[PDB]
């Protein structure tokens, strides 16, 4: 009965393609004709942080938009005071291979994970002074790539086992596992309400998960190569995904199909990080060409370039107050742009 | 004008000094990478030195060697192979008892990240390989194989086939047999050559 179910799947795929096509009447690009362009923007490196010796792989901004976290292959996970470029903590790591970092919304905990297939959670407000490893989660058969905090008790991680998992830090078990992806996943972005997230896999298909129910709800496939990073629109109805084929794409979950694409003929380097701004007008996008590009999210046109990194930027993220954007490249340099 | 930010600045300076000291202390050791197919004897060579990545640390003639064995995890090679850049050399391991190894070597030697790192190539199971060669020729494995059915010719052909999978003259491949525990001396000689090359290049003289 394999042929019958295969034919049913093909027919249903044709039906969903027809439904998606029938829901499209006009592209966003021509609708955005009336919008005046944002114009060229110039961003200067207000602050530069110099405390790392190896390649920086990931970071996260604090909730108060003052505190940073750093993750590098040197084995050090430092927390920066962005305004005064100070160091408040320096947490050594058991394994020097680190691929992600996370900052808790409450500012109490910090998570980390890399090629050791284990997510480590540190308590930064211990009564005994220094920061210690509060918990240690090990339930994946592959490297972790992204970690995000729902609450102080829940963490969602993206690993190399082609699955996404939701943990309960109080006891450290698999509360819910998310299966369905056929490739490695290295993208995570939780919606502002923190009840729904989207992850980007290597099969050129980012899927829309559900934290409560535990099952996938929507599947978006418009890319051609692996997904390197994903971000969620501040509204919560759209999200942007950066792939390895040197292009970014803006999907919408309510319309459940493409809206616009961001590509340039001169750009050949693949995307590494993608983020938005407070209003969603600007789409910051890291590149492997040692620079970051600022795209007009509505006009699908380039607005400016923020260069100044010797090596490729492996991380990028704007502040919660939308006052600065921080980029960290492989040259162990973090720069704050305002 | 800092009221009590002076104490925070002092703490930051202490943290920076500690980080600099740790980096200086941790830059003296040399990092080596391990490759090869499943059950290729790389664990055997690691034991001869006496869950994703396993780390082995030893010392030999006042030089700390760190060995990274990665084959314990199954994932996409290119998804994490960039994390292993700047490694001094790649200690490839080949078992002469079983084309997958050739394909892996050809894919890893021409990688963009490893366009300059030296490759140390070890051929294992020499005795049983010789016994198998005396038992039967390797024409089944290599349909284009020509020559006698001796041991030296077969080993030379295998070494040439492995070594003919690179296109960068700047990258050198060292080859040796194994299975007196003196391969550590070979690794030390190769790493000293690599250190000399790196120092000369960094001095602007090479």
């Amino acid at each position, epitope marked *: 009965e394999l042929d019958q179910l295969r034919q049913e799947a093909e027919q249903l795929k044709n039906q969903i393609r027809d439904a998606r096509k029938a829901c499209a009447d006009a592209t966003l690009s021509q609708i955005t004709n009336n919008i005046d362009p944002v114009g060229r923007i110039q961003m200067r490196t207000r602050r530069t942080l110099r405390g790392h010796l190896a390649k920086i792989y990931a970071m996260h901004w604090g909730t108060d938009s003052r505190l940073l976290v750093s993750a590098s292959q040197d084995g050090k996970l430092i927390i920066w*005071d962005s305004y005064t470029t100070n160091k408040v903590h320096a947490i050594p790591l058991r394994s020097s291979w680190v691929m992600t970092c996370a900052y808790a919304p409450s500012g109490n905990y910090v998570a980390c994970g890399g090629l050791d297939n284990i997510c480590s959670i540190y308590n930064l407000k211990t009564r005994e*002074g220094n920061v210690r490893v509060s918990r240690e989660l090990a339930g994946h058969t592959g490297y972790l790539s992204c970690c995000r905090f729902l609450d102080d008790n829940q963490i969602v991680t993206s690993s190399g086992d082609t699955t996404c998992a939701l943990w309960d830090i109080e006891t450290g078990q698999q509360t819910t596992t998310f299966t369905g992806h056929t490739g490695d996943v290295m993208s995570l972005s939780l919606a502002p309400d923190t009840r729904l997230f989207v992850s980007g896999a290597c099969d050129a298909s980012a899927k829309l998960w559900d934290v409560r129910e535990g099952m996938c709800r929507q599947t978006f496939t418009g890319h051609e190569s692996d997904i390197n990073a994903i971000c969620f629109f501040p509204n919560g109805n759209a999200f942007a995904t950066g792939s390895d084929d040197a292009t970014c794409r803006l999907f919408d979950l309510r319309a459940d199909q493409e809206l616009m694409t961001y590509s340039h003929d001169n750009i050949i380097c693949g995307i590494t990080s993608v983020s938005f701004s407070k209003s969603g007008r600007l789409l910051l996008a890291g590149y492997d060409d040692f620079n970051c590009n600022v795209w007009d999210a509505l006009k699908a046109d380039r607005a400016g370039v923020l260069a100044g990194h010797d090596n490729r930027v492996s991380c990028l993220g704007v502040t919660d107050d939308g006052m600065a954007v921080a980029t960290g490249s492989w040259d162990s340099f973090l720069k704050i742009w305002n | 004008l800092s009221a009590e930010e002076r104490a*925070a600045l*002092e*703490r930051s300076k202490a943290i920076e000094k500690n980080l600099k000291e740790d980096g200086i202390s941790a830059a003296k050791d040399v990092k080596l990478l391990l490759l090869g197919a499943d059950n290729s004897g790389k664990s055997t060579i690691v034991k001869q030195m006496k869950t994703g990545i396993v780390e082995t640390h030893f010392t030999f003639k006042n030089l700390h060697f760190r060995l990274f064995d990665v084959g314990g995890q199954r994932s996409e090679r290119k998804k994490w192979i960039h994390c292993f850049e700047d490694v001094t050399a790649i200690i490839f391991c080949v078992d002469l008892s079983d084309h997958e190894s050739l394909m892996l070597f050809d894919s890893i030697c021409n990688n963009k990240f490893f366009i300059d790192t030296s490759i140390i190539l070890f051929l294992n199971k020499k005795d049983l390989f010789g016994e198998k060669i005396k038992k039967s020729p390797l024409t089944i494995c290599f349909p284009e194989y020509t020559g006698p059915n001796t041991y030296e010719d077969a080993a030379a052909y295998i070494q040439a086939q492995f070594e003919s999978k690179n296109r960068s003259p700047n990258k050198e491949i060292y080859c040796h047999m194994t299975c007196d525990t003196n391969n550590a001396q070979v690794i030390f000689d190769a790493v000293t050559d690599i250190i000399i090359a790196n120092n000369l290049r960094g001095c602007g003289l090479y």
Partner: single-chain antibody
Amino acid sequence: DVQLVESGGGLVQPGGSRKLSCSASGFAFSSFGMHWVRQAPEKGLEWVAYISSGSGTIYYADTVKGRFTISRDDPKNTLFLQMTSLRSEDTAMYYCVRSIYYYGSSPFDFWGQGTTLTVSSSDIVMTQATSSVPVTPGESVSISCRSSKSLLHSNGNTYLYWFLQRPGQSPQLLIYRMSNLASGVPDRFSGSGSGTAFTLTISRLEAEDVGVYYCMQHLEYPLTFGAGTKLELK
């Protein structure tokens, strides 16, 4: 738990010498600045000395310069004070405290037990208007502390610390930066004020809150405490 006990006090002849050792166990002593605080038998707390992390900077009070010496020993995790040239006014009970500094830290969180010294026979001044008021349980009362200089720094946060000394034990930190509640403190405590007039407001007073309260200016050394506002039951 964190333990912080001092020893070395006793009877000292006028002009004699002594040593005070504050032994610490339970926390990373190598990264805490440590002060010494002196309290007269019938007066408020007074500052003595200070050391930084790694013995970087050493600070002293006005009337103490050149009198004693304070040192740190990280291997043994002990703070030392060199009791030298004890005058008639040096007789009091001494405390040792934790003073970790970083962005968001809470200095003076933990206070030592105390040792008694017995001897035979520009600075910011902070005044507390009231000295003692009755307070029935379940009522709301506010204590006031007024400074001399403006304690609101240019960086944004003003430095005002509120301490509570329960009768019979060491003082405990209540409020730091006059806006944040210390760890392990009930939410019924609150603090407010602006520039120079500060106040601490308590609601639903309980029997465990009777004591005396002190206000300290941490904007610049030396740190000056207050006379103290006393609360009494009924």
